[PDB]
Amino acid sequence: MSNISLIVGLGNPGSEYAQTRHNAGFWFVEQLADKYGITLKNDPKFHGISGRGNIEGHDVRLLLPMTYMNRSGQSVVPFSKFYQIAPEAILIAHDELDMNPGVIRLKTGGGHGGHNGLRDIVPHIGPNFHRLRIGIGHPGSKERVSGHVLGKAPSNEQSLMDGAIDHALSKVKLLVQGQVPQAMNQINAYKPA
């Protein structure tokens, strides 16, 4: 299998969004970057914040689109094209309404599932990239989805999501080493302590 060589976190820019559930992907990638001492720098050519460095023996690029969520493809698409990174070598971390806080899954392929960041990406690179689906819960009804994803979780739910993210961070070594089925088994088996 392709090694994962580009890890993208989805989210919105600005301090008013930094703690909102829709930035779960940013939380994952920011934490990963700091764990391996990869510096995320302003990258206006690709409408994002990006870095590059060694993660467990492999040279990996990290990307945070600064386009706002619904326009994420304006960063991800030209970045991945410029560095000639195939979709199969890309992992995209994002919030997942259909899983609860504390649930985290690695998925390969498929569509956007209504996620408006993924919606802006799949059309242009196709579906065959990996996704880290970070459960943020669903608020009961369709009307309250926007307020849920653009709001801050309470403490209890935030701990659960943080626990799930910690767990996936510990499996990034398998991902960058090309052991995607192993990583999928091990991520998808997580349950909180």
Query: Rounded to an integer, what distance in angstroms lies between the CA atom of residue 143 and that of residue 134?
Result: 21
**100 among the known binding-site residues?**
no
DSSP at 14: S
Residue 83 among known ligand-binding residues: no
- Resolution of this structure in Å: 1.6
Q: Name the strand (E) or helix (H) holding 82.
A: helix 73-82
Residue 94: active-site member: no
Task: Quote the CA–CA distance of 165 and 187 in Å, as a whole number.
Answer: 10
Could you give the 3-state DSSP secondary structure of residue 58?
strand
The secondary structure of 127-185, three-state, reads CCCEEEEEECCCCCCCCCHHHHHCCECCHHHHHHHHHHHHHHHCCHHHHHCCCHHHHHH
Residue 21 near residue 95 (C-beta atoms within 8 A): yes
Residues 133 and 112: beta-carbon distance below 8 Å: no
| Residues 6+ away with beta carbon under 8 Å from 123 | 73
CATH classification (class only), 1-193 = alpha beta
Q: Which residues pair with 83 in a beta bridge?
A: none
**Method used experimentally:** X-ray
Give Cα separations from 21 to 6, 13, 55, 161 (angstroms).
22, 13, 26, 9
Catalytic site residue from 22, 94, 130, 148: 22
DSSP codes joined into one string, 89-140:
GEEEEEEETTS-TT-EEEEES---TT-HHHHTTHHHH-S-SEEEEEE----S
Whether residue 17 is annotated as binding a ligand: the answer is: yes
41 burial class (0-12, 13-18, 19+ CB within 10 angstroms)?
exposed
What type of residue sits at position 70?
Answer: N
Helix ranges (DSSP H) in 4-69: 24-35
Which three-class secondary structure state does DSSP give residue 37? coil
Alpha-carbon gap, residue 50 to 69, rounded angstroms: 16
